[PDB]
Amino acid sequence: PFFDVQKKLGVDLDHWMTIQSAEQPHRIPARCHAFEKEWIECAHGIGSIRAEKECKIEFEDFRECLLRQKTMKRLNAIKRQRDKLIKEGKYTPPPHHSGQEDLRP
Amino acid sequence: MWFEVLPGIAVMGVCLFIPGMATARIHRFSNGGREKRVAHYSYQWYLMERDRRVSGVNRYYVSKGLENID
Amino acid sequence: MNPIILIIILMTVMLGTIIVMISTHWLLIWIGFEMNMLAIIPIMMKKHNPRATEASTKYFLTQSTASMLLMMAIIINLMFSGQWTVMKLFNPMASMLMTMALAMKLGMAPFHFWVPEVTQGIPLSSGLILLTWQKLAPMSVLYQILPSINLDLILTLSILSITIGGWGGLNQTQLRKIMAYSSIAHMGWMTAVLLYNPTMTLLNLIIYIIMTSTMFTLFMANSTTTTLSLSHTWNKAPIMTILVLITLLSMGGLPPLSGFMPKWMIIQEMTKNDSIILPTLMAITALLNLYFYMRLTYSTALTMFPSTNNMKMKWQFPTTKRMTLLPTMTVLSTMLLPLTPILSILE
Amino acid sequence: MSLVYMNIMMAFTVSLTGLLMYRSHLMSSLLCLEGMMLSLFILATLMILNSHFTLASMMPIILLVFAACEAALGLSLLVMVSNTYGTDYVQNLNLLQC
Amino acid sequence: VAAFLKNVWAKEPVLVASFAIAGLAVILPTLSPYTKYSLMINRATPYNYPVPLRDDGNMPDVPSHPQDPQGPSLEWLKRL
Amino acid sequence: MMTYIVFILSIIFVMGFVGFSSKPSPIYGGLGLIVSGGVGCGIVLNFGGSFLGLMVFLIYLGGMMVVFGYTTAMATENKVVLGTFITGLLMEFLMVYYVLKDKEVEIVFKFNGMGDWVIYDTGDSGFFSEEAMGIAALYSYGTWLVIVTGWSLLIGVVVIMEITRGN
Amino acid sequence: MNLMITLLTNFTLATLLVTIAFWLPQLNVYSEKTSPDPMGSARLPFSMKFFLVAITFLLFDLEIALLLPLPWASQTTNLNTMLTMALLLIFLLAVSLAYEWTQKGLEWTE
Amino acid sequence: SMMRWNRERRRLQIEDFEARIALMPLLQAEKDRRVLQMLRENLEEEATIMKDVPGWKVGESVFHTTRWVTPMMGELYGLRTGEEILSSTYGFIWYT
Amino acid sequence: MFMINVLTLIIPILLAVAFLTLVERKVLGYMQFRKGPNVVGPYGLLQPIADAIKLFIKEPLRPATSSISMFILAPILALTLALTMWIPLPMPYPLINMNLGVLFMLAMSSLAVYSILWSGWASNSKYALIGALRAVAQTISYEVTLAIILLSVLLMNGSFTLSTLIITQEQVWLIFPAWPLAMMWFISTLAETNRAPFDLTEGSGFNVEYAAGPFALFFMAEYANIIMMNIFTTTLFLGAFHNPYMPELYTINFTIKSLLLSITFLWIRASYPRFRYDQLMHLLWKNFLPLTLALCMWHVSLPILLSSIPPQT
Amino acid sequence: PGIVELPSLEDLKVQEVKVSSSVLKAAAHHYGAQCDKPNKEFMLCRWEEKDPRRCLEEGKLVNQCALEFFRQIKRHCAEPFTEYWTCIDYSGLQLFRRCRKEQAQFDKCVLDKL
Numbered sequence A: 001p002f003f004d005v006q007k008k009l010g011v012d013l014d015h016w017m018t019i020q021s022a023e024q025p026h027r028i029p030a031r032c033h034a035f036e037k038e039w040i041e042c043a044h045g046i047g048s049i050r051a052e053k054e055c056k057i058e059f060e061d062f063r064e065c066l067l068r069q070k071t072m073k074r075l076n077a078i079k080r081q082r083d084k085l086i087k088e089g090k091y092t093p094p095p096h097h098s099g100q101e102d103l104r105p
Numbered sequence B: 001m002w003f004e005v006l007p008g009i010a011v012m013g014v015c016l017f018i019p020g021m022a023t024a025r026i027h028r029f030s031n032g033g034r035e036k037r038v039a040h041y042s043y044q045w046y047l048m049e050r051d052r053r054v055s056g057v058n059r060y061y062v063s064k065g066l067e068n069i070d
Numbered sequence C: 001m002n003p004i005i006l007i008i009i010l011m012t013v014m015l016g017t018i019i020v021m022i023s024t025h026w027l028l029i030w031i032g033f034e035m036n037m038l039a040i041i042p043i044m045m046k047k048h049n050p051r052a053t054e055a056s057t058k059y060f061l062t063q064s065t066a067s068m069l070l071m072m073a074i075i076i077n078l079m080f081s082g083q084w085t086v087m088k089l090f091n092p093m094a095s096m097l098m099t100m101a102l103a104m105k106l107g108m109a110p111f112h113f114w115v116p117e118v119t120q121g122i123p124l125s126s127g128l129i130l131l132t133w134q135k136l137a138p139m140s141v142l143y144q145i146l147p148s149i150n151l152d153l154i155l156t157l158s159i160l161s162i163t164i165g166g167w168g169g170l171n172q173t174q175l176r177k178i179m180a181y182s183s184i185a186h187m188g189w190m191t192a193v194l195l196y197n198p199t200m201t202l203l204n205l206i207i208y209i210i211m212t213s214t215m216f217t218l219f220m221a222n223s224t225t226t227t228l229s230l231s232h233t234w235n236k237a238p239i240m241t242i243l244v245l246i247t248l249l250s251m252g253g254l255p256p257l258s259g260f261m262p263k264w265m266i267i268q269e270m271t272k273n274d275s276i277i278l279p280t281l282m283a284i285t286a287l288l289n290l291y292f293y294m295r296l297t298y299s300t301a302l303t304m305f306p307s308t309n310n311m312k313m314k315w316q317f318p319t320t321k322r323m324t325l326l327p328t329m330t331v332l333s334t335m336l337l338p339l340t341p342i343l344s345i346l347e
Numbered sequence D: 001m002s003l004v005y006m007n008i009m010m011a012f013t014v015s016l017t018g019l020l021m022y023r024s025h026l027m028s029s030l031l032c033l034e035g036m037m038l039s040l041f042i043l044a045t046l047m048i049l050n051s052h053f054t055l056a057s058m059m060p061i062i063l064l065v066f067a068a069c070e071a072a073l074g075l076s077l078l079v080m081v082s083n084t085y086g087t088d089y090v091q092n093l094n095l096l097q098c
Numbered sequence E: 001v002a003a004f005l006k007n008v009w010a011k012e013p014v015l016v017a018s019f020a021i022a023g024l025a026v027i028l029p030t031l032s033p034y035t036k037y038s039l040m041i042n043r044a045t046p047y048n049y050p051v052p053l054r055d056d057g058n059m060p061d062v063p064s065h066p067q068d069p070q071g072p073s074l075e076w077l078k079r080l
Numbered sequence F: 001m002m003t004y005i006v007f008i009l010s011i012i013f014v015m016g017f018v019g020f021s022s023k024p025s026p027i028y029g030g031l032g033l034i035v036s037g038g039v040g041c042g043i044v045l046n047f048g049g050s051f052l053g054l055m056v057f058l059i060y061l062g063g064m065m066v067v068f069g070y071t072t073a074m075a076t077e078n079k080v081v082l083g084t085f086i087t088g089l090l091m092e093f094l095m096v097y098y099v100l101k102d103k104e105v106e107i108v109f110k111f112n113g114m115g116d117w118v119i120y121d122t123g124d125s126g127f128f129s130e131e132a133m134g135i136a137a138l139y140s141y142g143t144w145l146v147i148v149t150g151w152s153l154l155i156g157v158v159v160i161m162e163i164t165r166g167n
Numbered sequence G: 001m002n003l004m005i006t007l008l009t010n011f012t013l014a015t016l017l018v019t020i021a022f023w024l025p026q027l028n029v030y031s032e033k034t035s036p037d038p039m040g041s042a043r044l045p046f047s048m049k050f051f052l053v054a055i056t057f058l059l060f061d062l063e064i065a066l067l068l069p070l071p072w073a074s075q076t077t078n079l080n081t082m083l084t085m086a087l088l089l090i091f092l093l094a095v096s097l098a099y100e101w102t103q104k105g106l107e108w109t110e
Numbered sequence H: 001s002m003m004r005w006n007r008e009r010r011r012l013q014i015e016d017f018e019a020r021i022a023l024m025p026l027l028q029a030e031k032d033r034r035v036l037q038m039l040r041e042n043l044e045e046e047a048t049i050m051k052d053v054p055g056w057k058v059g060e061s062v063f064h065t066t067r068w069v070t071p072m073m074g075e076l077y078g079l080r081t082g083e084e085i086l087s088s089t090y091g092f093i094w095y096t
Numbered sequence I: 001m002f003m004i005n006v007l008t009l010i011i012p013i014l015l016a017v018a019f020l021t022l023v024e025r026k027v028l029g030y031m032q033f034r035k036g037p038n039v040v041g042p043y044g045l046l047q048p049i050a051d052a053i054k055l056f057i058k059e060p061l062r063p064a065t066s067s068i069s070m071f072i073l074a075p076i077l078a079l080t081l082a083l084t085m086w087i088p089l090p091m092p093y094p095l096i097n098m099n100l101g102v103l104f105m106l107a108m109s110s111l112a113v114y115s116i117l118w119s120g121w122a123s124n125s126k127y128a129l130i131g132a133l134r135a136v137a138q139t140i141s142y143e144v145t146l147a148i149i150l151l152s153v154l155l156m157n158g159s160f161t162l163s164t165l166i167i168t169q170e171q172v173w174l175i176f177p178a179w180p181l182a183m184m185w186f187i188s189t190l191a192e193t194n195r196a197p198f199d200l201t202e203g204s205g206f207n208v209e210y211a212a213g214p215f216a217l218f219f220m221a222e223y224a225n226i227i228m229m230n231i232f233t234t235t236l237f238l239g240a241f242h243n244p245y246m247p248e249l250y251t252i253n254f255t256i257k258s259l260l261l262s263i264t265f266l267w268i269r270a271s272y273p274r275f276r277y278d279q280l281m282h283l284l285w286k287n288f289l290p291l292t293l294a295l296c297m298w299h300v301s302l303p304i305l306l307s308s309i310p311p312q313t
Numbered sequence J: 001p002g003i004v005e006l007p008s009l010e011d012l013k014v015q016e017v018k019v020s021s022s023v024l025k026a027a028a029h030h031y032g033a034q035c036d037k038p039n040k041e042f043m044l045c046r047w048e049e050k051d052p053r054r055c056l057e058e059g060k061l062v063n064q065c066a067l068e069f070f071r072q073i074k075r076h077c078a079e080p081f082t083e084y085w086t087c088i089d090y091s092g093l094q095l096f097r098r099c100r101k102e103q104a105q106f107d108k109c110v111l112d113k114l
């Protein structure tokens, strides 16, 4: 049983640590505040059975914000192709990716 | 008498004087005649790396003032 | 033990279970389980003999391993969901680990290997606390994560608990090991209907707590810890034999008694869901529980085993033990089946 | 996911299988349990710092304190067993077979 | 109520000092006039950027320049 | 080599666990868990959790493992151990060789083979540490958490003094 | 990086001085001899009291681990709550010491 | 003495924070141009590396949404030398 | 350049530990109406050198140890932790200017009991093991008041930065608002490093089973900890004037104060009889710890009632 | 999904404020006094659009108005300001509290001449 005493008595014992989108000290945002805000505002009140299949896009964007699976897979792809082209001698790294260009600011 | 102990205390005091004096000299030597930049917080490191990028010699301790802008 | 310290420690056990029940954060679930274990350790070492220290060591090792698996499941949920809400789990690895951890806390088979040992090592009031109050927290956590539980894992745990708790009590003469294998079988019954209708899980939990509390309260009132010590009760106080008769015929699921109320309703919620084979195996396996219950009724109520001479002295003194709620528990654990549609209050 | 999480999870499983396969002593079991706790601490800390989720920075300390209190309780049990048989051997704890 | 106090100050002066310091530490923040200024300083320390507002037209209490008169003032902190 | 440094520390971490999960003796096991705590502190410190790594030193190693070694020194005074050690080390090196020759692996979850420097943030947190402020919020926001932790520690004192009494 | 260089230098100097101190008089040849303690061969009696002071240290050290973010927590804006919970943690540490006192737990190591 | 001097230290801290607040729009604008510079350079090098790969879309986002996502460390420094990577990803942590 | 900075830290540490033995024997000489060593060098200045060259060619004791590895690693950990306590000390500028240098020093001084524990377990004598367990229980006892006094003091600092603790004390020594914490701090640092009247490892000590070389290494780690804790007490209560353009004013000033405080250790070991073991456990758990909790509550609630909360930065 | 939209390298070119951090921190309060409006339009645009790509043009106004801030120092009070930011630049934490009289000379020259 989930005796919801916190909603009954109106006290906030531990809802504050529950999500990243909650209120943080000195307004420090989490790295996936916008993604989790979109996922929670999608999935609020519609129940979990509708929320697993009607908020799939928001939750997959939020999960890939969390773990960065697709991003690191894409960086593996680009770095692997780059190293293959350097090994074949068909590509050269540019001056700004060799560290010789007096950075912007 | 009691002043015989002062040579040993003086040698121990010189050995305690060496590390701080030497690290002050080394900090003034490695940083353009100035103190070492204290970066405990992320904003201080961002300003320090911005100094390193605008100095043009990849040393943060080369201070560019009004002679650099037009 | 100081009575003030005993009150504070039992309030700490109850506060740990309440923190598991009322909180919306996984760290507070874990804190409640840690507090519950930390406070129930002196209830087991109340009498300070080597068997209670061995039972407390086995309980510590199993519940600590379970709490560490529980925290690993919480942490993988934090990986794959970024949030701490006590609801469904967002990874089948976290779901498997949390169901394993709660199985180790409930003593469901094949993680049951601490329950007949620890209950044998500790007193009867502490065994009452272990077999009744310590089931309320993990069944609540299982109640709240049931959209994430794999059906195959929880049903394997359920039927394996029913069969092992059935075959376990057939070889036992110690009353505490009989009640412990009875515990394992009834936990299998509670978790088998959990993903189909968890209201029947709460119903079986309440009826089980009433029947186990009745039997441990009768054992405490009569100071009987083995079968043969329970056999002397007809010569000391005969009404207790009638009460253990009606309570053990209740716990075996025999109608018209109220221990038939859970499992019938459990069958009533599993034949809805196209499952005929599994509640049939469950019902047929429950006859083993009913067999060793009938063994205890043959030794206690339906025959008269020979007593000793010194029992004649114990006729001259009344029972002064505070048999708290024993007539209320004995009425509620037997005569409650005509009130079977009261179960909707658990919805 | 990240590469360091593989090593911290494999560390947790190594300390688990050490805790799930006793050799002789109860102290070695408690040490494997606290290695499990240490790996959970490191893993929770890397997630909470990685995501910049601010309020859960007080989470691993809690995960320390309770579990360390747990270890204290375990050490007490070990001592009581070692006051009965002279050693902390887990093969002395076999009275509850009967 | 006082003979006991001289008794415990003779026998255990460390515990009398301990409970006196702990008693002052509990009751005395409720009695000081300066406990308000702790909060009034700790909210007036700007760790964040004071993100400006879109001027709709009805904000007479919000300035349009930092040196405007209206807005929160920290002259109480300079003066005290 | 240096861009993998956190990874490298984690390797030593796992090596240290095979140091004591193999359980050679509880005292060498305590030493292995001390070395593991040191390198896991290094893992935490290389993300910016300075306070949490110093809690690994001050409270875990210097506070609790002291009590483990202290109790062990007053309560205790093969080939299975060596085989367990080499088996765990070889499984770890096979994992390292796989994820370094493929840059991707899947034991139970999918794991990238790149350095874990890639997943960081490219911003600054101003005149605080985010981790120090999240721990400072234990007293302002975390009231209930402080209540249950202080009650569990008081009850921990009570429970230890009850069960170590023997009466 | 400068810290790791400093730690490695200090550990290297420590290891080098330990290697000197164990191996510089191994160049000496001096002799050999037999060389066979208040207790002779009796095993160490377990003193319960040293274990009690160790566990009491551990519990108060966990309470100190809770108390450590107070210099950072004094900067908060919820100062009445912060002051209440700070004084409450130090009061529960005092209650732990009072219970450790009055149950004779601090005895013969008072 | 500590009352007067800690009040003075709070006034000096507020002065330094107001200096930072006056500087933050310039540093924010320079940071925006910095990260857009690095992403444009990485995009052009991705377009000239990922040509042989069949079915490759250069600059395809891994997110379904069209919202700006804050670029990861490996998205900016994924194609640079190891010194710039180490200096940018462990510079503040390893600074003394 | 930085390796030069590390060596100019740690070599004069070892030389100051060397001449601390001469200063100790001379000051304990004159406080006992006699002279200390003055034959060997001119006024005795070659006594630590003669002592070291004697000890490093003494025969090893060649013992049977229960463990080779911990018998080796106890002086290694001793010298390593005794030398790395020096690196965050702002004097006027630290070697490693870290944000949590106070917490670093507290954690590394908490790790030093493993040298006592391992070097007592490595000796085969069980009575030596009893001495090691008593010394470890003493040290971990007084670490409690180290931590709580340190926290109660740094509530007036604002952060765990050691270098900010100079900026704190530009107007007053921090021994004026916190002298009871100061005097309990001084006794607690006196009881950490096994210094009289708390040296119960003189009476069997834990390291009576080592050779003369490794005993000299344990001894010099002990004295490095003595000079270090006196410098730490100097920075933390008796903080000096700091000119950013002439740092040697701060260096000479904290040097003179740290020498007077180390001489005060020497002047305390020649003045009092030793505590019995339960009497210093009574000193900690029943005298220092209630006052330390009371003054901790007072220094929590005191910047709030005075509106004198220090800045974080 | 979609191709990400990034502006060109010609869109990102602007005359940089190539001064150090102490040169900025020395003139920080007069910058916040005098360069209020483009900085606040930029940070309002930056917190509302939540996208740097929508805040390029306003960002250039920031980099347009800071330089006009410094030229007007370089025309009139280059010597008191150089004497002031050098003293700010010596300190490791870059304190204001160590440099109050060069601050008084610089603020005197700014208040008179500008």
Ligand SMILES: CCCCCCCCCCCCCCCCCC(=O)OC[C@H](COP(=O)([O-])OCC[N+](C)(C)C)OC(=O)CCCCCCCCCCCCCCCCC
Pocket: E011, E012, E013, E014, E017, E020, E021, I175, I180, I182, I183, I184, I185, I186, I187, I197, I233, I237, I268, I272, I283, I286, I287, I288, I291
């Ligand atoms: C850090 C800079 C230097 C510091 C000072 C260095 C110089 C001084 C060194 C002196 C020599 C020390 C050698 C070792 C001494 C060991 C003995 C020892 O310490 O015993 C401790 C003794 C122990 O007591 P005892 O054992 O002597 O007495 C008997 C005690 N019973 C009954 C329990 C057996 O005293 C203390 O613990 C006192 C600690 C400090 C107390 C500070 C009190 C501050 C004032 C509080 C308020 C009082 C007013 C009332 C309330 C007002 C409210 C408005």
Ligand SMILES: CCCCCCCCCCCCCCCCCC(=O)OC[C@H](COP(=O)(O)OCCN)OC(=O)CCCCCCCCCCCCCCCCC
Pocket: A001, C010, C125, C128, C129, C132, C133, C136, C202, C205, C206, C209, C210, C213, C217, C220, C322, C323, C324, C325, C329
């Ligand atoms: C959705 C669910 C939410 C939760 C709902 C409520 C769940 C209630 C679960 C009840 C579990 C009871 C646990 C055990 C009792 C707790 C109090 C206790 O510790 O009692 C033991 C006590 C010890 O006495 P002692 O002296 O130590 O015994 C040795 C001999 N001298 O005293 C004794 O030993 C005295 C002997 C008799 C004790 C009888 C106690 C009976 C309590 C249970 C009543 C039945 C359950 C309540 C109704 C159903 C609720 C589901």
Ligand SMILES: CCCCCCCCCCCCCCCCCC(=O)OC[C@H](COP(=O)(O)OCCN)OC(=O)CCCCCCCCCCCCCCCCC
Pocket: B011, B014, B015, I015, I041, I042, I045, I046, I049
């Ligand atoms: C940071 C500061 C650290 C300071 C550390 C050092 C403190 C002590 C400083 C030195 C004190 C004075 C030393 C005097 C040594 C004795 C001199 C002497 O006259 O020795 C006589 C001896 C035998 O001479 P003989 O030929 O027999 O005489 C017959 C005459 N008809 O002749 C001999 O024995 C031969 C000569 C031996 C000389 C030894 C000198 C001492 C060496 C100490 C090592 C450290 C030196 C300083 C290092 C730091 C500075 C570089």
Ligand SMILES: CCCCCCCCCCCCCCCCCC(=O)OC[C@H](COP(=O)(O)OCCN)OC(=O)CCCCCCCCCCCCCCCCC
Pocket: B039, B040, B041, F034, F035, F037, F038, F039, F041, F042, F043, F045, F046, F050, F053, F054, F061, G001, G003, G004, G007, G011, H092, H093, H094, H095, H096, I073, I076, I077, I080, I081, I084, I097, I098, I099, I100, I101, I104
């Ligand atoms: C028996 C074995 C042998 C025994 C002898 C040798 C071992 C014991 C003695 C050495 C102990 C090592 C302690 C290392 C960590 C100390 C804590 C620490 O690093 O704190 C300093 C600092 C935090 O301060 P902060 O200013 O916040 O961070 C910089 C950002 N401004 O943080 C930083 O600056 C972080 C710097 C980068 C990360 C450095 C990580 C180094 C590797 C970890 C420890 C390796 C040793 C492992 C074994 C230890 C055994 C206990």
Ligand SMILES: CCCCCCCCCCCCCCCCCC(=O)OC[C@H](COP(=O)(O)OCCN)OC(=O)CCCCCCCCCCCCCCCCC
Pocket: E008, E012, E015, E016, E017, E018, E019, E020, E022, E023, E026, G091, G094, G095, G097, G098, G101, G102, I289, I290, I291, I293, I294
């Ligand atoms: C409300 C604010 C918060 C209060 C709590 C915070 C406390 C902070 C300090 C931590 C103290 C922790 C440990 C306290 C233990 C107390 C129990 C005790 O020590 O009792 C025994 C003692 C006699 O000692 P004995 O047992 O003989 O020991 C042998 C050698 N002494 O017995 C005694 O010495 C008698 C002790 C009781 C009488 C003391 C009276 C003190 C009066 C101080 C001024 C008024 C304070 C008002 C506050 C409320 C007091 C109730």
